[PDB]
Structures are given as structure tokens and as C-alpha cells.
Amino acid sequence: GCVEVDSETEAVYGMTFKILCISCKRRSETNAETFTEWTFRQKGTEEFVKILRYENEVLQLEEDERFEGRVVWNGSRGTKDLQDLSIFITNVTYNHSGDYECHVYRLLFFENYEHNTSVVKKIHIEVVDKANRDMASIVSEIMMYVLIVVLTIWLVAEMIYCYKKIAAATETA
Amino acid sequence: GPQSFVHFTKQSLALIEQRIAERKSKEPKPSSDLEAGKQLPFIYGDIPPGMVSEPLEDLDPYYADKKTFIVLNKGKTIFRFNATPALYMLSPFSPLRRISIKILVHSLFSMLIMCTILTNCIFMTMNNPPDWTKNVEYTFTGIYTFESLVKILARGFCVGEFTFLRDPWNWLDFVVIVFAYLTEFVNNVSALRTFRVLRALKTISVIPGLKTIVGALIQSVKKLSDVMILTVFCLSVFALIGLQLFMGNLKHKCFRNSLENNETLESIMNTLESEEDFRKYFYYLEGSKDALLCGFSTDSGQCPEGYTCVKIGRNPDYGYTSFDTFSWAFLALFRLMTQDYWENLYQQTLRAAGKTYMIFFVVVIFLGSFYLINLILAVVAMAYEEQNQANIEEAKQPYWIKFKKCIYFIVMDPFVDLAITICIVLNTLFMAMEHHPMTEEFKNVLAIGNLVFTGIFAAEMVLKLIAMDPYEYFQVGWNIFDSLIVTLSLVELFLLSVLRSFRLLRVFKLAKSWPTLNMLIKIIGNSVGALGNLTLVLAIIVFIFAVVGMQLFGKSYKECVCKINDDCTLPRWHMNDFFHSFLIVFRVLCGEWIETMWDCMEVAGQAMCLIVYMMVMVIGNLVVLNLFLALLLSSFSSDNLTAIEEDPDANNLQIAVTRIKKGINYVKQTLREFILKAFGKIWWNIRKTCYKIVEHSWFESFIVLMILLSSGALAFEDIYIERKKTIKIILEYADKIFTYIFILEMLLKWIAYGYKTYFTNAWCWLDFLIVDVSLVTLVANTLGYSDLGPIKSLRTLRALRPLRALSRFEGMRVVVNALIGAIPSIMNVLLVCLIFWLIFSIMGVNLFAGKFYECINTTDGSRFPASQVPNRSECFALMNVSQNVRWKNLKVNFDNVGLGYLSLLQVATFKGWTIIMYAAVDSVNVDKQPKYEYSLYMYIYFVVFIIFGSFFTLNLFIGVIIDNFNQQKKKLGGQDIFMTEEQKKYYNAMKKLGSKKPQKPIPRPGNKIQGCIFDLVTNQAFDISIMVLICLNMVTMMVEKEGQSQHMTEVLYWINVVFIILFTGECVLKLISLRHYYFTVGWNIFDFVVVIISIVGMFLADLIETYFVSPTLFRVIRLARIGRILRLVKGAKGIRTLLFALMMSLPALFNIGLLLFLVMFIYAIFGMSNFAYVKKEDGINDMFNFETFGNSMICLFQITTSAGWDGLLAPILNSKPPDCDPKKVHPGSSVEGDCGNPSVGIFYFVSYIIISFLVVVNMYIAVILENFSVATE
Amino acid sequence: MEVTVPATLNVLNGSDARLPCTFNSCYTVNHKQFSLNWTYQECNNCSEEMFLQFRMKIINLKLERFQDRVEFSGNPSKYDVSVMLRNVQPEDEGIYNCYIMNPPDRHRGHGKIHLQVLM
């Protein structure tokens, strides 16, 4: 159906990056009309600046150097009912590190009732030269290896002890 | 003896009166063989012609002293009249009374009354009789008047002993005959007609043998008193629990946040009448009669954005579904016990309260709908066994000659009969190849094949008819059956759509060599043979209920039609005419009553429909159950006695088998003859060390622990796994470690046991297969083929790793061994059932193939009228004219025989059957738009299938399961088959509890006041007073309702506080009197715990409701006052014994439940991996799906009872557009498409329902054995 | 819908005449959609005259022939649409009827009372 997965925080300089923004409706059988506006606050600054607006299957980009020619759409396609609002950076630079705000403007259509809603999501992006491996993966691999060696050592010790015991028992007979 | 036959003359009367006078001046049972209404003994011989049907003197010496006289008919039936003059007018010697006697005891009189009754019963089926029927009604009441006058003139009216009014069945005749005239000369038509229905009950008196059936039916009930009391008590306790938990929750609705014109929910609510404007303020799903339910917790249903959940308005289902009062909650609990549409209520309650409250439904389903039903069945079966045992206990106490001989020789037993059998099988297979989208070539091939088969069968008929004599030809029943089939096939050849399907009956000719098919044939024959009167009583009761419903509610259905239908037309189920009323009665007997009950209560009123429906349920279910038990035991023990050998006459199939054994073996031996003519202790120490390690308890515990961990790691893999990155990585590495550990275990077992013993063990084989699949998957993932289609399909097989727990737990192993030992006979009965269902599937394909297509407007799903678009071509023309138009077919239909098998499974379980029946009765032809109830009488097809392929099929399966499981218990020495040895020891220890002799009485304390308290608390009056106090407390909590005033709440609180004080005072008095001897009783300990529970729960509930905000905790804590009510069990003895039987059944039920839980866990993992992304429609929605483990187990517990499995299977039957979208994009996942896999889904659901049926049958037999052992010991 | 009305009613001159018209419809009468019409015709084939009607409330047309002697004497909720005639005159003799339309019932009710005035 629809799962609100958070965006990845780290982007590699010179490569491509996708900034997730997913905003599911509380009930999936309802009909809505959605658009978005993205605002960006760079590091060393404190003001959020609008960069793009997407509505009615056309993506509008504001006139800013840091994102011109480097941003394409990665949200929902072929609908006005947009539940995926993500964008794609095709060439990451060091000016793309900062705070991103994903404003979602949804207009539900009910029986004799229109409800105009709004959602805001915050994404923090860090631009690095080399991708850093996750701490969870590192510790999980290390703990799997230590569990392997611990179990093998325990099994070998028990095997040696019982082999000696049964050998002594056989020689006693 | 035979010479004791004299006429009743005035001298005899004078002698009898003199004897009576002598007895009075001075101031024993009659022979049952001579009792009235019995056949005259053969010892008396024949009767001379001159005194038959004449007043004769009494034969029984008991009445020889009193003034009686008897009359015998031409069939030797004895009638005992009274010698006292009738009304003091007509003497036995009067000619008028002589003629009245001659009329009364005669075959033609009874025949005339019977024909009158049947004609009247036929006449009561018309809902709008013509005007000329009044003369027929007058004739009927005149005939009844004549019969009653004859009876009164002969027997006398009321004064005497053997008189008209002494017979209970003559009271019905008198009531009917006074009602007729009173209604005629008193002028509600419905009430008068419903009283006219009483004439249908006179069938019991006129048809011989029905009074005995009714008496046995009444006798079976009187042994149910304790079970009824326990059922009422348990239903009341669960109703109180549900009233405490769910009061007012089904009134939650999604109310919109924005209201114009300064409006409020209070001001809006009192200006809303229709559903159209109720839809403008509350959220409705499309095409729904009720507002969507919601909750305030996180596990309840959610409201759309722009709405807030609020408790306001009415309850769902016309307001009839709620836990607001004790009566509505009791109705809900009875519905749950009978499991009628219970998944709808279950889903509503989970939506309104939270998914966490499925514990309530699990406990209620298990305790009520399984255990109470088991108790009812066991008690009725014990009653009928006792009555059957008593019954059998008292019972014991030239050229034509030449060529006809040649033709007779031509018909050879081992060859002609085998050829006929092969031809029958081939013809059945040929007919099973029909399907709807069939070419003309295939149709021609089938037609010529059927013609050839019919010609062959007719030729065989002619050869047998000219070989043997025609009189000798018609002496065997199978030959008559063959003749009927042949002539009917010829009649169809000369010319319907159903007459073609009657040749399918030739399959039953296989029962001459198939013993299990013969068993079903014998059961069906018994249903109309030795048990024909019981079936007749059942049919009469169904007829009476149908006509009563039609006369009571038929006009209300038409007059109040727009209260139950927006189109203002009659619904599918109603009582406006006789056929639909019978259909409703039959559906109630199938187990579905609440949905039609809602319509009945809407058109006619709650009380009348409630009374009628519960009468139908109780009486019809009792009669159906009695018929089921009679059929089962008769065809189980009475019919099977091994009187004759296994095919005593050499079976032609057996002769052919012997001839094959001769010929093939001889030919092979001769061919072999022709071919021959033409032509190191250290390794033993290692093995013993591995044996010591593997066998140790620590190793087994470790492996069990890791099996549990690896099985529980599968539940975390759901649609939200992408949010849990760390858990995902941890689970990947955990899968690696588990694979390593289990490979190490397999290697250790290899070295310890050796290849031979390891690979001749089935558990080791299963573990080997699981570890091989895991290792192949791991090596493919590490190599790089982690994205191949077959590799992913094999990765879906990790759901079977929980199977490693079967060999590790003793209880599951024992249950699995029992099932494996039961499989063989189950296979034979399965074969018989599959052939029987194949016949019906072929018939359904002949009737309904290609006729369920229809043109529908896809926006609202409404079928177009047949005025416009009557054809398929018009439908396609309109699809070019209009966009939202589709010529669509049902998913489950009779287009071929496999789909027919699926349809028959949905009809047999009564899950999804109504859609199929509506499509069947609306059908017209192929490429023709369906019309409403055009084929109305195709409901007969479904009723006949339900009867024969469910009732008789289940009778056969149960009858063989009983015998197989009895043999299984017999072979091992009578031990329990669902219990482990330690459980057996605990079972014996528990058994010694209920078989204790009375213990030492508690000795009274020496003190005076303590002694007075002792004799006060040890009296019976004290205990009965405590019991009535408990009943009063039960009533006090039954008073509580939703929306009650604050004064009500305060006074109820203070009454309950007073009850708590009284119970604590009783506890204190018992403590002071009995001292530490008070604790030597288990019930005293239970009461002490209950008192502590009451005080602590009251204080804690007050604390939560005052200095806290948590209604849920308040209700859960207040569920603690139920303990004061559970002490009513102490006073009741029968229900105490039944609860002891349940406690005895507990261990085996625990083992079977463990196995069921493991199976449902495996199926949940598979369902999560398969159906997590299908379209949300039918029974799959935002709360009941396979997206997470909890949701999947919620869905699977529901269909363990089979409730709603069709609605879950329907979204999986979508596999191509426009039903689904293969390229559907799901945000937050890389999975594409919302389509299903119809083969995987069908296998999944059919296999699960079959396995659930088998396991639940195991639970049934466990509980029944526990009851039979306990109650008969 | 069974409309229960007296076939013929005799009322003394100078007294009041209650005209009982009752119907049984299994649906509740709501005043927004319930329709009641009362005509007066001098004969069976004569012209019918609107004098009393109900659309949302009791509507009195106040015909000149009846002066102000026509009042409603019933309760639509209680299925009582009876009218009454104060001080019956000899000219009041005729045929009186009550058409009834109670949604959501499909059928239309019809009643007839032959009011007769004697000396």
C-alpha cells in the first residue's frame, strides 16, 4: 500500500541522490488532489528558500544556481493523488548539504465536503566525499563472527571432554 | 387363547357390573401386548368373519373387572372403548353407536382423513387464494366435523376412562374445530390463518408411527436440562463481560470537523432523518447502509482527514447490533455461540474498540461455540444411544432357445462387466470435459462420444433383456436402475438442460465393487427406509414453519418493503410467498438466521420474529440432529454385521483380477523362460562422543531455543520492514547464524546416528529438507543470484522452518501421529466424496456454464436492466457508447468442473454461496443478460446439493472417523491418543479429584458463641441465602445499560457496595467459625480469593476513575466483579460435573491447540509473503489484510471457523486488468503490482480450511470422549 | 393503504359533524412529505372542490360555501386526518372524500363519506 519511509541522510559528492518524501493518506480509498513545495536552508544559513514546486504533472524549478539542471522528479506519477513526493539530485555538490522541508498540500474530496490539509516533513542531508558504512552493519557482522567462533569453541571443548571421558571409560572396561 | 373370543352382550355387561358391585361391597397392570393400538398376538390366530369390527368383550384380565369392551379390525388392531353409554345416551348395543364404531375403526376412514389433511396442507401454501377456495375450506371443516362427531359418538365425550377427550391428540382436533367456527362467525386474518396451520399437525395422529417419533424427540430433550442451564449461565456471563467491555462502542462515527452556520453536533443530530443527509455529516463507505465505525486507540479503525471519531447516533444493522443492554449483548453472544455471521460483528468490534480485543473473541469462540455445542451433541447422542439400546433390549426379549443361450454365454462375468465398468468411468470422464468457451469441434466430439456411450449401454440392456427372461430381468434392483437410466437417455435423445445430467447416476453402479460407496448408498436408503418416519417428521416440521412464517409476516414484507430496500421492491429473502418462506426456513436450518431476522424485525416487530426464529432454530436443529444421530448409529452398527462374506458371490471384478493374476504372471514367466533359452576404534569413539552430545538435554534445549528464535524472526518481515533498518540487518545476520547452527546440528546427527538410521527417520528427513533449502538459498545469495525468480520463489519457502518444532514437542508429535494413523480411511471417504461432488459439478456445468456474465455499470456495480442491453452485443455497443460499462463474469462459477468444485466448496461451507445462487436463479442463457429470478426454481439444485453432498457426506465421514479412531484407541490398549505420558499421570491425578468419598466433617469449636456461629454457617439455609444473594447481584449488574442516568449509576454503585460488604461479612463469619479448617476446601479458597478480588478491584477502579484518566483500564479492572457470579457453580451439580469434564479435556485440547497455532503461524508467514500487496476489496481492507503478522493472524483465526474465507479469496482471484494493476506503484516499497496469484490463493485457502476442519474434528472427538467417559462412570 | 371511512354519515342540522378519515400505512407520517387532500363533490360525477389540504401544515382554503365552519379534527402522526364541520347546514349534504399520500408508500389513498343532513 503506502509506507512512510524516511529519507537517507548522507549523500556522496559527485554522485546521484534521491531525497524521499512520502505522505500517505489516513484512509487509502479517499480521493485527493495534492501538490508540493520544497524549501532548502543551506548550512551556514538560517532562512529556508523555496527551490521547486510540483503540481499537475509539471515540475517548476526556481531560479537558483545550486539546483538548476540537477533536480528531477521522483514522486508519484500519472495522478493528482500524490502520496510520494520525493525528488532526485543527479549531481550532488557541497551546496546541497542542509535542511530540506517538504510541504505537502492535500485537498480531500468527500460527500458535500472538501478538506484542505497540509503536511511538512524535514530532511537533513550531509554531503561527504566517501560513503560511510552503517554502525549497525559493522556491529552485526562483528557479533555474527564472534558468535560463530564462540559456538565452535564451545562445541569443540565439549567434544574433547566427552571423547576423553568415554576413552577413559572404555580403557577401564 | 384363540378360543377366547366372545361378543359383548348385555349379559356380559350385567356380569361386569355385578363384579364391580361385589368389589365395592368387599371394600395390577394390563398386558402390554393387549394394550390399545397394538397388533393382536398371533397366538389368538385369525378371527371368524362374523365378529370382526364388532363390540367384543375385554381380553385383558385387568379391565375384565371394569366396564370395558374392545373392537378388532381386519388388520388385527385393538381398540379399547368404554362400556358406559356415550353421554349417557348411546349404549354399546345401539345401532347408531355400532355404525359409529364401524366407521371409526376402519382403513378407509383413516385414508380419507389423511387425504383431506394433505389436500388442506397443499391449500395453505397459497398466499392469495381465489374466491372459490372458500367452498373447499367449508368442505374441509365439514369433513373434520364429521370425523369428530364419529369419534364422540363412538368413544363418548369426556366422562369415561377410554373416551374422546382423554387422548391428548384429540385436544388438537377439538381446538381446530372450535377455532374454525369461531373465526367464521366472529367477523386479524394472519392470526386466524396461523391457527388454521394447526390442522397440519393432525398428520401425527393419522399417519402411523409418527407419535412414537414425536415421543422420542420429546424424550431426548428432557436429558438436556443441565446443559441448557450451563449454556444460559455461560452466555449470561460472557454477555456481562461484553457489556462491560463494549458498551456504546458501536456508536462511534466519523463526524466532520468543519460545520457552517454556527452548527453543533447536538443541533445537527436532531435535524437528520434520511441517510442522504446523514451522509453529509458522517463518513460512509460507498454503497453502505451504516456509517463507518472508528475508535480512539491506535489499534482501532481510523477516520479520514477532516473527521473526528465521536460516539453518537444509532448502532449498525438497523440498530440491532450492540453491547448496550444485557438483552442485546445476550443476542450477540448467542449469535457468537451459533457463529451466524459472527465475523461481521468481530470486525465491527475490532474496528470500534481495537485489534487487542480479539482475545475476547478467541475465548468466547472456544468456550461457547465449541464446548457448549460439544456438550449439546454429546448429551443428545447419549440419550439416543440409551433409547436405541433399550429398544434392541426389549426387541430381543428351438432357434430362439439356441441363440438366447448363446447370448447368455456372450455376457461373461469377468469381461463384459469389467467392460461396462470401464465404459461408465470413461463416460463420466467424457462428460467432465465440458466447459463454457468451447469450440464447435469439441462440442461435436462430445456429442458423438455421448451418442456412442448411450448406444453401448442400450445394446447391453437389450443383450441382458433377451439373454435372460424379461420377468427374470426385472427381479434385481440394479437392472431396474439400468433400465430406467437407459429409457430416460433414449427419451432425451428423441428430444432438456437437466435431463442430460441424469445419466450421471450410472456412477453408483460402481458400488457393487466399492464398499465405501455402498456405505453412502445404505445411509441414503436408511434415510427413507428404517428412518423414513423421522425424515417425514422433519419435512412436516419444515412445511409447518414455512407456512407459519408466510401467514405471519408475508403481507408485512410487501407493505413495509421500503424499510428494508431502497428500491422499494422485495429483497432476495422474504416470506411473501410459500417458496421464499421455505427458502428462509432452509437457510435458518443451514445456520444463517440473523440477517433475515433483521429484515423480519424491521417489517413485523422484534417480539414476533424473535419468537418464531428461536422456535425454528431449537425445534429444527433438534430434529435434524436426531436424524443425523439415527442415521449415523444405524448405518454404523446396525447395518454392518458381517452377515455375508466380502462379496460372497465371486465379484466379476475379483474374477477378472484373478484371471489377470493368472495370465500376466504366466506370460512373464514364459517370457523369462524364452529369454533363458535364447541365452579404527578411534572413529567409534568419535561416533560415541557425537551420540553423547546430540542426546543430551542441553543440546536439545539449545536447538529448541534457536528453532523458536528463527521462527519468531519471520514475523518481523512485513511491509514496514524498510522503516526498521537496524532490525533488518540484524535479521539478515541472524539468518546466517541460524543456517550455520542447523548445518552443524545436521552434521552432528549424521556422525552420531549414521546415514541408515538418519535417512530412515521422517523427522530427520524433514529437517534435512529444510536445511537444504536454507543452504541453497544462502549459497545463491552469497554467489550473486539473489534476484532470480526461482531463487525468490524458493526464498518464500522459509515460512516452513517452524516445522522443525513438530519433533521437539511431545504433544504436537502425539497429535500428528494420531492424524497420520487416521489418514488412510480419510482417503477412501475423500475419494467417495470427490466422485459424489463431481456428479454435482458436472450437473452444475450443464446448467450454469457461460450464463453468469452480465453488463454492469462499473461506477456503482449495478446490473443493467434487460429491456436495454439484453445481449452481449448490445453490451459491447454500449461500452463503445459509454465508458464505465463492462461485460463481466463471476470469479467462482460453473464454467468448468474445477471452478464447479470451488463453487460446491463455497456452497457446502455456506460461505459465498448466496452470490452463486443469485447468479444461478438470474440466469437466462449464454450471451444473454440475466433477469431477476428468471430461473427461480434453480434453488432446488442448491438445496438438493446441500442435503446430499453435505449432510450425508458428513454423516459418512463422521461414521468412518468414529470407527477408525476407536480402532486406534483399541490397538494401543485403550490409552488416550492426544495425551503424553506425563499428561496421562496428571490426568489420573485429576480424575481422583472428582471421585473422592466424603471427607471428615469439620468439628465445632468448644466456645458457645463460636458454636452458635458454627451451626449458623454450616446450615443449608445459609448456603441457599448466599446463592440467592449472588443471583440478586447478577440481576443488579444485568440492570446496567448505555446512557443511563447518574441516579441509576449512583444507586447501582451503592447496591454493589452493599453486596461487597455482605460477602466480606460472610467470609469473616466463616473464618471465625471454621478457623484454619476453613482453608481445607478448594471452594472456600476460591471464595476468599473472590472477596479479595472484589475489594481490591472496587478500590482500584475508584482510584482510576477519580485520580486518573483511563477508561480502558477502568473497564478491565471492573471485569473483576464477575468473580462473585462464578460462585453460582458451587451450588449447581450438573454444571459442576460438566465443568469438571472440561477441566479433564484441557490437556489434549492444549496439545491440539499448540498444533493449530503452529499451522496458523506458518500460514501467516506465507500469507504475509504472498498477499501483502493485493487490492483492498471484498474481505481485505485497511484493518483485515496480510500486511503485518498481527493482521494475518487476525485474518487466519477468523477462517479457522471458515467464516468469510470467500471474501479473503476474492481479491486474490484478480490476475489481469481491469481487475488489478500489474504495474501498481507502492510508496515506500519496490514491489510492483496489486494482482493476486489465483492458483496459490486457491491452494492456500482450500488447504487451510481442510486442515482446520480436521484439527477441529480432533478437538470434537477429544471432548466427546471426555464427556462419555465422565458421565457414564 | 387501507383507508377507513364511513360510507354514509347522518348529522342533525345545526350540530357539528366530525368526518372520520383514518388510514393504516406502515411508515411513519413525516410532515415534510405527507400529502392530504379533502374534496367536496355534490354528486359522484360532479366537480370536486378543494377546501382542506395538508402540504407541511394544516391548510384551510376557507371556501365561501362552508363560510368558516371547517376545522381539522385529527392528527397526521396518529394516522388521523379527520375533518369536522361546525353547525352543519342543509347545503352541507353531499359527498366528502380524503385523498392520502404518505411517502415512501407508492399507493395513493382514497376515502369517501356521504354526509346526509336530516331535519
Ligand SMILES: *[C@@H]1O[C@H](CO)[C@@H](O[C@@H]2O[C@H](CO)[C@@H](O)[C@H](O)[C@H]2NC(C)=O)[C@H](O)[C@H]1NC(C)=O
Ligand atoms: C441481441 O439483442 C438485440 C436487442 O436489440 C437484438 O435486437 C437487434 O437490435 C438491433 C439494434 O437495435 C436492431 O437493429 C435489430 O433489428 C434487432 N434484431 C431484431 C430481432 O430485430 C439482436 O438481434 C440480438 N442479437 C443476437 C445475437 O441475438
Ligand SMILES: *[C@@H]1O[C@H](CO)[C@@H](O)[C@H](O)[C@H]1NC(C)=O
Ligand atoms: C452563531 O450563530 C448565529 C445564528 O444563531 C449567527 O448569527 C452567528 O453569526 C454565529 N456566530 C458564530 C461565531 O459562529
Ligand code: NA
Ligand atoms: Na446469517
